[PDB]
Amino acid sequence: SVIEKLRKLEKQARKQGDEVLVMLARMVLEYLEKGWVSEEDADESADRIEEVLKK
């Protein structure tokens, strides 16, 4: 699930105190629910958020 991936990343960012990445994961989720981003672009966003989280 793209949604489950983004929720897990949001919580990992909350655990790291990474407030920008919290917002990006949270808002990709909101955009996906609103139909403002495609599922494929949300999945790619999750992958990028994960990369930035590791840095």
Residue numbers in the entry: 1 to 55
Q: Could you give the paper's own sentences about this structure?
A:
The design of proteins that bind to a specific site on the surface of a target protein using no information other than the three-dimensional structure of the target remains a challenge. We demonstrate the broad applicability of this approach through the de novo design of binding proteins to 12 diverse protein targets with different shapes and surface properties. Biophysical characterization shows that the binders, which are all smaller than 65 amino acids, are hyperstable and, following experimental optimization, bind their targets with nanomolar to picomolar affinities.
Unlike antibodies, the designed proteins are soluble when expressed in E. coli at high levels and are thermostable, and hence could form the basis for a next generation of lower cost protein therapeutics.
